[PDB]
PDB file of C-alpha atoms and ligand atoms in Angstrom:
ATOM      1  CA  UNK A   1      -3.663 -20.501  -6.073  1.00 51.77           C
ATOM      2  CA  UNK A   2      -2.706 -18.097  -3.173  1.00 50.63           C
ATOM      3  CA  UNK A   3      -4.102 -17.583   0.415  1.00 52.30           C
ATOM      4  CA  UNK A   4      -6.213 -14.374  -0.111  1.00 52.77           C
ATOM      5  CA  UNK A   5      -9.983 -14.880   0.563  1.00 56.90           C
ATOM      6  CA  UNK A   6     -13.159 -12.808  -0.024  1.00 55.47           C
ATOM      7  CA  UNK A   7     -11.766 -10.362  -2.608  1.00 53.21           C
ATOM      8  CA  UNK A   8     -13.838  -8.936  -5.452  1.00 54.29           C
ATOM      9  CA  UNK A   9     -11.943  -9.278  -8.798  1.00 58.47           C
ATOM     10  CA  UNK A  10     -11.814  -5.876 -10.635  1.00 59.95           C
ATOM     11  CA  UNK A  11      -9.432  -6.925 -13.467  1.00 61.96           C
ATOM     12  CA  UNK A  12      -7.119  -9.714 -14.609  1.00 60.55           C
ATOM     13  CA  UNK A  13      -4.663  -8.719 -11.816  1.00 59.63           C
ATOM     14  CA  UNK A  14      -6.410  -6.361  -9.339  1.00 60.78           C
ATOM     15  CA  UNK A  15      -8.562  -7.576  -6.431  1.00 61.99           C
ATOM     16  CA  UNK A  16     -10.279  -5.489  -3.691  1.00 62.57           C
ATOM     17  CA  UNK A  17     -11.768  -6.175  -0.223  1.00 62.03           C
ATOM     18  CA  UNK A  18     -13.210  -4.111   2.687  1.00 61.49           C
ATOM     19  CA  UNK A  19     -10.507  -5.024   5.102  1.00 64.31           C
ATOM     20  CA  UNK A  20      -8.115  -3.455   7.592  1.00 64.14           C
ATOM     21  CA  UNK A  21      -4.726  -4.000   5.811  1.00 62.95           C
ATOM     22  CA  UNK A  22      -2.991  -4.522   9.250  1.00 65.37           C
ATOM     23  CA  UNK A  23      -5.591  -7.233  10.244  1.00 67.18           C
ATOM     24  CA  UNK A  24      -5.406  -8.963   6.750  1.00 68.04           C
ATOM     25  CA  UNK A  25      -1.580  -9.149   6.950  1.00 67.28           C
ATOM     26  CA  UNK A  26      -1.741 -10.868  10.393  1.00 68.20           C
ATOM     27  CA  UNK A  27      -4.173 -13.526   8.987  1.00 72.16           C
ATOM     28  CA  UNK A  28      -2.546 -14.053   5.508  1.00 71.39           C
ATOM     29  CA  UNK A  29       1.188 -13.378   6.244  1.00 69.61           C
ATOM     30  CA  UNK A  30       1.678 -12.421   2.575  1.00 68.95           C
ATOM     31  CA  UNK A  31       5.113 -12.353   0.867  1.00 68.20           C
ATOM     32  CA  UNK A  32       4.734  -8.522   0.508  1.00 68.88           C
ATOM     33  CA  UNK A  33       2.623  -6.029   2.406  1.00 66.83           C
ATOM     34  CA  UNK A  34       2.777  -2.426   1.103  1.00 64.92           C
ATOM     35  CA  UNK A  35       3.122   0.421   3.569  1.00 63.27           C
ATOM     36  CA  UNK A  36       1.829   3.907   2.793  1.00 62.95           C
ATOM     37  CA  UNK A  37       5.151   5.470   3.719  1.00 60.21           C
ATOM     38  CA  UNK A  38       6.541   8.977   3.737  1.00 59.85           C
ATOM     39  CA  UNK A  39      10.086   9.811   2.588  1.00 59.49           C
ATOM     40  CA  UNK A  40      11.364   9.797   6.198  1.00 57.81           C
ATOM     41  CA  UNK A  41       9.769   6.416   7.007  1.00 58.68           C
ATOM     42  CA  UNK A  42       8.157   8.112  10.019  1.00 54.99           C
ATOM     43  CA  UNK A  43       5.248   5.737  10.634  1.00 55.66           C
ATOM     44  CA  UNK A  44       2.996   7.946  12.710  1.00 52.23           C
ATOM     45  CA  UNK A  45      -0.490   7.435  11.375  1.00 48.59           C
ATOM     46  CA  UNK A  46      -2.761   5.842   8.860  1.00 45.84           C
ATOM     47  CA  UNK A  47      -1.546   2.583   7.399  1.00 47.60           C
ATOM     48  CA  UNK A  48       2.095   3.165   8.548  1.00 44.49           C
ATOM     49  CA  UNK A  49       1.270   3.908  12.194  1.00 43.06           C
ATOM     50  CA  UNK A  50      -1.108   0.949  12.464  1.00 45.24           C
ATOM     51  CA  UNK A  51       1.335  -1.513  10.734  1.00 43.13           C
ATOM     52  CA  UNK A  52       4.097  -0.030  12.816  1.00 45.04           C
ATOM     53  CA  UNK A  53       1.997  -0.368  16.002  1.00 43.67           C
ATOM     54  CA  UNK A  54       1.221  -4.018  15.036  1.00 46.44           C
ATOM     55  CA  UNK A  55       5.038  -4.664  14.897  1.00 43.61           C
ATOM     56  CA  UNK A  56       5.452  -3.238  18.453  1.00 41.69           C
ATOM     57  CA  UNK A  57       7.538  -0.398  16.861  1.00 42.91           C
ATOM     58  CA  UNK A  58      10.071  -2.816  15.316  1.00 44.23           C
ATOM     59  CA  UNK A  59       9.174  -1.381  11.858  1.00 45.56           C
ATOM     60  CA  UNK A  60      10.116   2.119  13.084  1.00 46.29           C
ATOM     61  CA  UNK A  61      13.401   0.913  14.644  1.00 47.28           C
ATOM     62  CA  UNK A  62      14.395  -0.791  11.362  1.00 44.76           C
ATOM     63  CA  UNK A  63      13.241   2.240   9.337  1.00 47.16           C
ATOM     64  CA  UNK A  64      15.301   4.679  11.420  1.00 50.86           C
ATOM     65  CA  UNK A  65      18.432   2.599  10.791  1.00 51.83           C
ATOM     66  CA  UNK A  66      17.556   2.542   7.023  1.00 52.20           C
ATOM     67  CA  UNK A  67      17.232   6.344   6.883  1.00 49.83           C
ATOM     68  CA  UNK A  68      20.388   6.923   8.966  1.00 48.11           C
ATOM     69  CA  UNK A  69      22.298   4.830   6.363  1.00 48.23           C
ATOM     70  CA  UNK A  70      20.539   5.828   3.092  1.00 50.07           C
ATOM     71  CA  UNK A  71      18.763   9.132   3.621  1.00 48.67           C
ATOM     72  CA  UNK A  72      15.162   9.794   2.688  1.00 50.26           C
ATOM     73  CA  UNK A  73      13.237   8.079  -0.098  1.00 47.84           C
ATOM     74  CA  UNK A  74      11.930   9.995  -3.128  1.00 47.40           C
ATOM     75  CA  UNK A  75       8.227  10.772  -3.478  1.00 47.84           C
ATOM     76  CA  UNK A  76       7.162   8.011  -5.914  1.00 46.85           C
ATOM     77  CA  UNK A  77       9.927   5.736  -4.610  1.00 47.26           C
ATOM     78  CA  UNK A  78      10.121   2.698  -2.355  1.00 48.08           C
ATOM     79  CA  UNK A  79      12.345   0.418  -0.361  1.00 49.18           C
ATOM     80  CA  UNK A  80      11.999  -3.189   0.718  1.00 43.01           C
ATOM     81  CA  UNK A  81      12.416  -3.870   4.462  1.00 40.70           C
ATOM     82  CA  UNK A  82      11.332  -6.625   6.799  1.00 41.40           C
ATOM     83  CA  UNK A  83       7.657  -7.492   7.136  1.00 40.98           C
ATOM     84  CA  UNK A  84       8.248  -8.389  10.812  1.00 42.43           C
ATOM     85  CA  UNK A  85       5.220 -10.326  12.204  1.00 41.99           C
ATOM     86  CA  UNK A  86       2.950  -9.213   9.335  1.00 41.75           C
ATOM     87  CA  UNK A  87       4.585 -10.431   6.095  1.00 41.65           C
ATOM     88  CA  UNK A  88       7.900 -11.698   4.727  1.00 44.10           C
ATOM     89  CA  UNK A  89       8.692  -8.203   3.362  1.00 44.51           C
ATOM     90  CA  UNK A  90       7.263  -4.716   3.657  1.00 41.99           C
ATOM     91  CA  UNK A  91       7.442  -2.633   0.510  1.00 42.90           C
ATOM     92  CA  UNK A  92       7.435   0.978   1.801  1.00 44.18           C
ATOM     93  CA  UNK A  93       6.000   3.090  -1.040  1.00 44.15           C
ATOM     94  CA  UNK A  94       5.780   6.881  -1.015  1.00 41.33           C
ATOM     95  CA  UNK A  95       2.761   8.187  -2.790  1.00 39.73           C
ATOM     96  CA  UNK A  96       2.425  11.961  -3.162  1.00 41.29           C
ATOM     97  CA  UNK A  97       0.830  13.682  -0.179  1.00 39.50           C
ATOM     98  CA  UNK A  98      -1.718  16.191  -1.606  1.00 39.89           C
ATOM     99  CA  UNK A  99      -1.864  17.847   1.900  1.00 41.92           C
ATOM    100  CA  UNK A 100       1.900  18.767   1.385  1.00 39.44           C
ATOM    101  CA  UNK A 101       1.537  20.052  -2.270  1.00 38.27           C
ATOM    102  CA  UNK A 102       3.140  16.962  -3.957  1.00 33.61           C
ATOM    103  CA  UNK A 103       2.543  16.324  -7.699  1.00 32.85           C
ATOM    104  CA  UNK A 104      -0.359  13.824  -8.057  1.00 33.60           C
ATOM    105  CA  UNK A 105       1.379  12.697 -11.346  1.00 35.73           C
ATOM    106  CA  UNK A 106       3.872  10.918  -9.014  1.00 33.48           C
ATOM    107  CA  UNK A 107       1.101   8.483  -8.009  1.00 31.07           C
ATOM    108  CA  UNK A 108       1.750   6.463 -11.215  1.00 31.98           C
ATOM    109  CA  UNK A 109       5.498   6.287 -10.376  1.00 30.64           C
ATOM    110  CA  UNK A 110       4.567   5.126  -6.862  1.00 28.77           C
ATOM    111  CA  UNK A 111       2.394   2.254  -8.170  1.00 31.45           C
ATOM    112  CA  UNK A 112       5.144   1.211 -10.657  1.00 31.41           C
ATOM    113  CA  UNK A 113       7.101  -0.046  -7.612  1.00 30.27           C
ATOM    114  CA  UNK A 114       4.456  -2.768  -7.235  1.00 29.26           C
ATOM    115  CA  UNK A 115       5.498  -4.305 -10.580  1.00 25.58           C
ATOM    116  CA  UNK A 116       8.771  -5.539  -8.985  1.00 24.61           C
ATOM    117  CA  UNK A 117       6.723  -8.026  -6.897  1.00 27.49           C
ATOM    118  CA  UNK A 118       4.592 -10.861  -8.269  1.00 28.45           C
ATOM    119  CA  UNK A 119       1.906 -10.647  -5.518  1.00 25.24           C
ATOM    120  CA  UNK A 120       1.215  -7.879  -2.960  1.00 28.10           C
ATOM    121  CA  UNK A 121      -1.258  -6.953  -0.215  1.00 28.38           C
ATOM    122  CA  UNK A 122      -1.620  -3.123  -0.475  1.00 30.04           C
ATOM    123  CA  UNK A 123      -3.663  -0.076   0.459  1.00 29.85           C
ATOM    124  CA  UNK A 124      -4.717   2.532  -2.103  1.00 31.28           C
ATOM    125  CA  UNK A 125      -1.698   4.807  -2.442  1.00 28.21           C
ATOM    126  CA  UNK A 126      -2.113   8.505  -1.579  1.00 26.65           C
ATOM    127  CA  UNK A 127      -5.588   7.762  -0.087  1.00 28.08           C
ATOM    128  CA  UNK A 128      -6.622   8.439   3.504  1.00 30.94           C
ATOM    129  CA  UNK A 129      -4.485  11.111   5.211  1.00 27.57           C
ATOM    130  CA  UNK A 130      -2.370  11.539   2.039  1.00 27.45           C
ATOM    131  CA  UNK A 131      -5.355  13.489   0.665  1.00 26.23           C
ATOM    132  CA  UNK A 132      -5.830  12.088  -2.882  1.00 25.67           C
ATOM    133  CA  UNK A 133      -9.185  10.990  -4.317  1.00 27.56           C
ATOM    134  CA  UNK A 134      -9.310   7.206  -3.699  1.00 27.42           C
ATOM    135  CA  UNK A 135     -11.352   6.655  -6.916  1.00 28.06           C
ATOM    136  CA  UNK A 136      -8.425   8.192  -8.849  1.00 28.34           C
ATOM    137  CA  UNK A 137      -5.922   6.071  -6.904  1.00 28.02           C
ATOM    138  CA  UNK A 138      -7.788   2.872  -7.827  1.00 32.14           C
ATOM    139  CA  UNK A 139      -7.855   3.936 -11.524  1.00 36.48           C
ATOM    140  CA  UNK A 140      -4.077   4.607 -11.518  1.00 33.90           C
ATOM    141  CA  UNK A 141      -3.531   1.275  -9.740  1.00 32.21           C
ATOM    142  CA  UNK A 142      -5.527  -0.634 -12.397  1.00 31.53           C
ATOM    143  CA  UNK A 143      -3.815   1.225 -15.264  1.00 30.21           C
ATOM    144  CA  UNK A 144      -0.252   0.854 -13.834  1.00 30.43           C
ATOM    145  CA  UNK A 145       0.158  -2.378 -11.822  1.00 30.67           C
ATOM    146  CA  UNK A 146       0.547  -5.550 -13.915  1.00 27.21           C
ATOM    147  CA  UNK A 147       1.388  -7.911 -11.019  1.00 26.51           C
ATOM    148  CA  UNK A 148      -1.259  -9.398  -8.722  1.00 27.41           C
ATOM    149  CA  UNK A 149      -2.405  -6.795  -6.185  1.00 32.56           C
ATOM    150  CA  UNK A 150      -4.846  -7.455  -3.325  1.00 29.96           C
ATOM    151  CA  UNK A 151      -6.220  -4.035  -2.199  1.00 29.91           C
ATOM    152  CA  UNK A 152      -7.471  -3.699   1.401  1.00 31.48           C
ATOM    153  CA  UNK A 153      -9.844  -0.720   1.854  1.00 30.49           C
ATOM    154  CA  UNK A 154     -10.391   0.011   5.518  1.00 30.81           C
ATOM    155  CA  UNK A 155     -13.469   2.263   5.027  1.00 30.57           C
ATOM    156  CA  UNK A 156     -16.614   0.129   4.339  1.00 32.52           C
ATOM    157  CA  UNK A 157     -18.462   3.199   2.890  1.00 35.03           C
ATOM    158  CA  UNK A 158     -15.508   3.984   0.567  1.00 36.13           C
ATOM    159  CA  UNK A 159     -15.130   0.303  -0.443  1.00 34.10           C
ATOM    160  CA  UNK A 160     -18.761   0.280  -1.630  1.00 35.70           C
ATOM    161  CA  UNK A 161     -18.282   3.529  -3.547  1.00 35.99           C
ATOM    162  CA  UNK A 162     -15.026   2.248  -5.165  1.00 32.76           C
ATOM    163  CA  UNK A 163     -16.789  -0.941  -6.373  1.00 29.94           C
ATOM    164  CA  UNK A 164     -20.038   0.743  -7.476  1.00 29.18           C
ATOM    165  CA  UNK A 165     -18.155   3.507  -9.458  1.00 27.12           C
ATOM    166  CA  UNK A 166     -15.481   1.192 -10.994  1.00 28.32           C
ATOM    167  CA  UNK A 167     -15.261   1.360 -14.797  1.00 27.70           C
TER     168      UNK A 167
HETATM  169  C1  LIG B   1      -5.706   0.298   9.756  1.00 30.36           C
HETATM  170  S1  LIG B   1      -5.820   0.107   7.961  1.00 30.36           S
HETATM  171  C2  LIG B   1      -5.913   1.755   7.278  1.00 30.36           C
HETATM  172  C3  LIG B   1      -5.703   2.883   7.961  1.00 30.36           C
HETATM  173  C4  LIG B   1      -5.862   4.102   7.288  1.00 30.36           C
HETATM  174  C5  LIG B   1      -6.260   4.054   5.945  1.00 30.36           C
HETATM  175  O1  LIG B   1      -6.457   5.184   5.181  1.00 30.36           O
HETATM  176  C6  LIG B   1      -6.452   2.869   5.326  1.00 30.36           C
HETATM  177  C7  LIG B   1      -6.894   2.840   3.882  1.00 30.36           C
HETATM  178  O2  LIG B   1      -6.935   3.857   3.291  1.00 30.36           O
HETATM  179  O3  LIG B   1      -7.131   1.801   3.286  1.00 30.36           O
HETATM  180  C8  LIG B   1      -6.336   1.763   5.996  1.00 30.36           C
END
């Protein structure tokens, strides 16, 4: 038994809910929240700017130190940093940004990062301002992640479409 509430079960290991991932993290304080990061860990918008805003910019301060030491992530890659006031840990995962010409095939590599963690609160990778088809992202998630993933879908209209179209 874990602390997640109100999720629809899609598979053995994948759960989904119409929820603001930033709001959900504040309530649940999960072990791992996933950020929709870019390779620079520049948390301007979407999930990263809202999680970063919810940390009062502490996520960005930590991320800048990480990049100064390590250089940029790979598209499809990840790093584990603090979860600040939202979670124990934040797994920053870089899905391909379709609006920058990145190979959508890297979405599977991105979701493979989730398998290093037993339970995660996550958004749909490469969805929103990263420009991918969220229906595709949910299919790759289901077909790639084997650990227990709690998906928060901010858009109520999209949530309903994801559920009603799910195979
Ligand atoms: C504030 S939560 C958030 C923001 C932007 C997004 O695209 C998503 C989402 O895609 O689930 C969620």
